[PDB]
Amino acid sequence: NMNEPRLASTLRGGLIIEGNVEQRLKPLQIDFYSQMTVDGGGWGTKNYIQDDEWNNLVWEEYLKQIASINIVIRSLTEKDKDAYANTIAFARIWRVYVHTLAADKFGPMPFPAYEIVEANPPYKSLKDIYDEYFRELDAAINGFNDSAQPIFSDAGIDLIYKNDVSKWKRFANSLRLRLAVRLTEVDQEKCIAEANAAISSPAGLISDKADNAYMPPKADGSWGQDYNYTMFQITWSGPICMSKSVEKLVTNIGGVAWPQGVVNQTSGVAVSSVHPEKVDPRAPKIFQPGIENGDWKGLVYGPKAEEANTGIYQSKQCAELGFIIKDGYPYKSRPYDLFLSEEVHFLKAELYARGFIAGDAKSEYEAGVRASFATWGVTSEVDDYLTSTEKNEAGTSARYDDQQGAGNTALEKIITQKYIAGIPDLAQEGWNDKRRLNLPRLDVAVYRDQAVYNNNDKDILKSANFIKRMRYPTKESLINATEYEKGKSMLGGKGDIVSTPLWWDKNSNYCTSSK
Numbered sequence: 001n002m003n004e005p006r007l008a009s010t011l012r013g014g015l016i017i018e019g020n021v022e023q024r025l026k027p028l029q030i031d032f033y034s035q036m037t038v039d040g041g042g043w044g045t046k047n048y049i050q051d052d053e054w055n056n057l058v059w060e061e062y063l064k065q066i067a068s069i070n071i072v073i074r075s076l077t078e079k080d081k082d083a084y085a086n087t088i089a090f091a092r093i094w095r096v097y098v099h100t101l102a103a104d105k106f107g108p109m110p111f112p113a114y115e116i117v118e119a120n121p122p123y124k125s126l127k128d129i130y131d132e133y134f135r136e137l138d139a140a141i142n143g144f145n146d147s148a149q150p151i152f153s154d155a156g157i158d159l160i161y162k163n164d165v166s167k168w169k170r171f172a173n174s175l176r177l178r179l180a181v182r183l184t185e186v187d188q189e190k191c192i193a194e195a196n197a198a199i200s201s202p203a204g205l206i207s208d209k210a211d212n213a214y215m216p217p218k219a220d221g222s223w224g225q226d227y228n229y230t231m232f233q234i235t236w237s238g239p240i241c242m243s244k245s246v247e248k249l250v251t252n253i254g255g256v257a258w259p260q261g262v263v264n265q266t267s268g269v270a271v272s273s274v275h276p277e278k279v280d281p282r283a284p285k286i287f288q289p290g291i292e293n294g295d296w297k298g299l300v301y302g303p304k305a306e307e308a309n310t311g312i313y314q315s316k317q318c319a320e321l322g323f324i325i326k327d328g329y330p331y332k333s334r335p336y337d338l339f340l341s342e343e344v345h346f347l348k349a350e351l352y353a354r355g356f357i358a359g360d361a362k363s364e365y366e367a368g369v370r371a372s373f374a375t376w377g378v379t380s381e382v383d384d385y386l387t388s389t390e391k392n393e394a395g396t397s398a399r400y401d402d403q404q405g406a407g408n409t410a411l412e413k414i415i416t417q418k419y420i421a422g423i424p425d426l427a428q429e430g431w432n433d434k435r436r437l438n439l440p441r442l443d444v445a446v447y448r449d450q451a452v453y454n455n456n457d458k459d460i461l462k463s464a465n466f467i468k469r470m471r472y473p474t475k476e477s478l479i480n481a482t483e484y485e486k487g488k489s490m491l492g493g494k495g496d497i498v499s500t501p502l503w504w505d506k507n508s509n510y511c512t513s514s515k
Contacts, residue, residue, distance in 0.1 A: 003075050014062075047448050074115070092139065107126060107491055138176070254385035264290065343418065368417060406512055467499075
């Protein structure tokens with residue numbers, strides 16, 4: 001009967017924004033892997049060394065949230081499937097979304113079914129997991145009915161769309177397009193067929209800022225219930241830095257000169273002479289100068305833990321998060337970005353540029369960049385940015401027609417702009433595209449787990465130099481051995497380690513940067 005309070009807790013719960021398990025999967029893992037942000041601390045995950053205690057908490061939390069959504073779906077379908085059709089349809093969408101965050105990290109894993117109560121849910125291949133995604137998303141879009149009860153009894157309960165069914169259909173369809181482009185390397189036939197179904201759907205996609213999916217934090221004074229980057233960097237005085245790789249991507253590109261009055265809003269220290277002459281207008285709005293000396297430079301990624309906060313690795317002397325400060329105070333109430341209209345444009349832009357589907361790649365590329373400059377309040381700069389031939393330190397320019405030079409291909413432009421538009425909340429999609437296309441260009445970590453990596457191999461064009469997955473919790477090999485070995489067999493290769501490429505990962509390299 002009381003299924004609403006259970007399904008309402010899976011909204012923030014499934015996304016994991018409680019500042020505890022969140023810290024151990026977002027800033028201290030997938031942020032390091034995508035290099036979207038770099039906490040200055042001496043964490044071993046920066047060197048791709050797994051913390052099994054963290055991975056177990058992350059693994060248990062996602063499956064706990066999926067099981068909770070399954071309790072609501074199973075009880076409502078049995079009680080009244082026709083009357084609670086809009087609640088069941090939404091629950092099937094959120095069940096898909098939450099599981100993607102788990103499956104894109106660990107790979108083949110359990111996907112507990114809602115139809116029956118599984119005593120020990122079996123490990124499923126990423127093929128079966130992804131085939132279930134599209135199947136569930138398609139049925140859930142057709143599941144909604146205006147005659148049925150609203151998603152929740154109160155509109156305020158739905159933190160994302162406030163009971164707006166049409167916006168949930170757009171998000172579900174945008175997720176179908178996102179998971180379809182994930183299969184460009186492993187299965188072009190399914191990638192194109194699922195993307196065509198997503199683009200042709202009458203439900204539509206996230207086509208404008210009004211359709212964007214956000215998750216607002218509580219911001220009610222409760223511990224770890226804010227936009228938690230504010231607690232890690234400001235409250236705990238731990239700089240979360242811009243990476244050297246991102247500095248190379250945002251420098252010079254767009255031709256727009258460095259803006260005036262750039263200061264660290266925590267210490268009040270103005271930007272030093274250490275900053276580029278020209279920079280992407282979004283960069284100084286995402287990252288503020290170093291809290292100690294005002295240097296605006298990227299933190300070199302992945303040195304040995306004992307070298308953290310020493311020499312060039314001083315996080316207080318590198319550019320840190322700046323958008324987490326609003327009106328002179330910590331932006332604690334900032335909603336988490338789930339799916340923005342920018343990504344939908346770059347998803348279609350990639351499919352059109354690669355000749356997978358017929359369409360105007362340039363128009364989708366520019367519409368994506370313009371929506372991102374609107375998101376970061378720099379629309380007055382987007383016209384000069386898009387017409388500039390100035391190349392970043394990867395060799396990529398913003399002008400779509402200027403496809404000459406190393407690192408300046410059409411696909412490299414799309415992924416560079418898709419990556420910047422996703423900083424930092426879309427780190428999982430940043431890590432997904434880095435595994436799928438080896439894009440954008442990122443620096444190879446100074447030190448990586450020597451039991452897994454050859455430190456002499458720092459070729460940026462080798463996708464195997466970048467982490468492929470997070471290891472399973474080691475407790476799975478002890479109390480769930482039969483199913484753990486099945487998951488290990490599905491992974492193949494060297495087994496349950498960080499360097500094993502996932503099903504959709506063919507170690508494809510589309511980076512053409514010379515340096």
